[PDB]
Amino acid sequence: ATFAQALQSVPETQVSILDNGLRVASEQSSHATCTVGVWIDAGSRYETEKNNGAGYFLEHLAFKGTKNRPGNALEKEVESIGAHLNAYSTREHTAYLIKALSKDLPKVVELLADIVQNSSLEDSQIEKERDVILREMQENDASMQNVVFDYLHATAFQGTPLAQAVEGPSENVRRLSRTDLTDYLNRHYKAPRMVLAAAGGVEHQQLLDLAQKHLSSVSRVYEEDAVPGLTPCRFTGSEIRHRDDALPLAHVAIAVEGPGWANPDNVTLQVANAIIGHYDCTYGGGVHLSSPLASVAVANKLCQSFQTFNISYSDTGLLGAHFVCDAMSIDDMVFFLQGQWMRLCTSATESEVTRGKNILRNALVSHLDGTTPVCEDIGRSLLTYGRRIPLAEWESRIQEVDAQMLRDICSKYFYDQCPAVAGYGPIEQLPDYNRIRSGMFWLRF
Template identity: 30%
Template sequence: MSVRITTLPSGLRIVTDAIPHLETAAVGVWIGAGSRHEGDDEHGLSHLLEHMAFKGTRRRSARDIAEEIEMAGGDLNAATSTEHTAYNAHILAADMPLALDILADILTDSTFDADELEREKGVILQEIGAVEDTPDDLVFDLFNASAFPDQAIGRPILGTAERVTKFGRDAIGGFLETHYRAGATIIGAAGAVDHDQICADAERRFGGLSVQASKTESPPALYRGGDIRLKRRLEQAHIVIGFEGLTYKSENFYALQVFANAVGGGMSSRLFQEVRESRGLAYSIHAFHWGFSDTGLFGFYAATGAKDVAELMPVALDCLGSAAHSLTEAEARRAKAQMKVSLLTALESPAARCEQIARQMMAFDRVLGREEIIAKIDDLTIEQIRRAGARALSSAPTVAAIGPVGKVHTPDRVAARLRAI
């Protein structure tokens, strides 16, 4: 690989991957703090801070930030997740110094202007409202909350309207000071990049990050499972049935990933073929497996009409349960091929590759070689894949549903159906 890694004296880490023949580059700053690092009185603060970073510094107004990067043909974006926050830019190679300067400016010298803060709170309230109006998004928030009740990892990343309206500049500044520290920060870049120049620029521009030890620890996640449903006048029931998955650090993580892909990751998967193609019970159905630093979530989502809920539930559960016993070599090969294509596709996009190497550094303190990952996937046996699925399905079920939910199975019925297979 052409990956290079440097740790500056401050603890700030820089990882780059030079991709030949490209003329553009992606660069981003990843902070090891997200929504699960918030205290009870900070719910939604990491997401608000991400928004406010673009609202002006002592050198640039919010409009200046947008105009400068777009004058160079680039773009800026950011995202808050459960365990980290990322700020990204995509630019021509020659404009890397500009991108780093803007990223450093917004992360070390934002003013958090009071008027901008009030306006941005309004924007976030609109965002929260949009989720409330989008059942296929909201059902996953309900699912997470039911899987991890009374825990930060289970709370919606956006926060609540009541809490967001109360945040002031001091709260934002305090969260930034506590969590936005050099030792918890990674700068990633991929494409037409010069590693040594990025290191020199980063050392000069990111001196404003605190060099104190990071305080990004969070309480261990405790998966419990549960049942939550909202009865609404909708044409479809939006359903998520899930179980405890695996941390991305688990030796069985890839086995459960393959299992999820095989049962519900594509048009040839069991869920798609049986639920949609053979029976026409749903337009949308797919399985998922999300890994976190100390836990994971596995399950499936489906949207179906009220009259089809009763039939869909046992059919979908039978697809999962039977796969844990009878998943075939051909199904496993297809799922493995999908995963490998997804992995290798990231090598063809500077933005995707930038995110990939930064996330790997955040998770493992190193970049995983593609040969290493492909070998882990290829070496999985059908028995390992089935066992990973069976282990997940034996955990306490979590049920979340919105719409006409009267015929959605309870967790006890879900568990009983799976035991009977």
């Protein structure tokens, strides 16, 4: 068969709402694994300066203490069934994931129902996990692209709830007690901001009967009718530059505010971002690589790596490029990156956009190949897009994108805009912000 018939033959996600409003979705396929996870809409957003590390602390803390199965009885039960867990926490999503066999499904959803509602919070575990969180946050300074992405989120959205980290600062970790964490659990872990993603190996009527038995009546009504509210965060085009000249490699990111999740143009900004592409120095393509920024970078030995990202949040996104470069070619990488960006934005070709559309189609089906990242897509799509967009509709959104369409909405979201610039390392040969802005908008057009 063909591509459109094959992505039609990819099975649908039945999404259903329980008696409290919690959303349940599954993707039944042929494999015998089973990847049930709860996605909660809490994150670093919907946190103030107080209780800032509460989402990362509860992500760390939901496995260690339980009301019904106390101590390490969660670990003993999940290794009696032999399963694997995961807990990633982002700026707008926190999640709990179990990959298992499909014959352990009431044990998996019972362990999730004891994780997300009946988690106990012992103060000895609070002190021990506070020490482990402080040691991990000291270890996280080596994670330099995470440092630069956190600096970019600090300098891109200053004065907003998106300025703060997911982990929280060290002056805010040390004052987090139990009652602030259970206030965060009573506020932001509410049931219709929670989805139950399954992927293959399951049956949806079995999952809805088990969600009626276990994950029903979590919490629906607020305490004093005090609803949380999302705000449109201000994007401030700024520059932060952490200068460490003894450090070997400079990580510099440049990002413009993109439209975000609910706006329909993430496909065309992603196909511009995928025309620009990515490079690391272990890639054996050489000079003959298709992306001309990577071809120029390996032609004149500019940088070690560059990665072009479209990180999206609800109405606010960061789309840009982060490069690991040396101390002597940041001006070259910034000039050739803005030249490739606005060569794309002025002179986009049909061969370039069909290369990008093909690499986006392959990147989306390679992302949604595996059961754990397709559950990541099910949870993120159910919390953000409302419905879950199937890949036939993603193909129909991809196939309408042409070079003219890309040129004007690139002129909307790229041209003459003030970007946010972050840098950790030897940031001396970064240009100053007026040279970044003069290297944005073109001398010809």
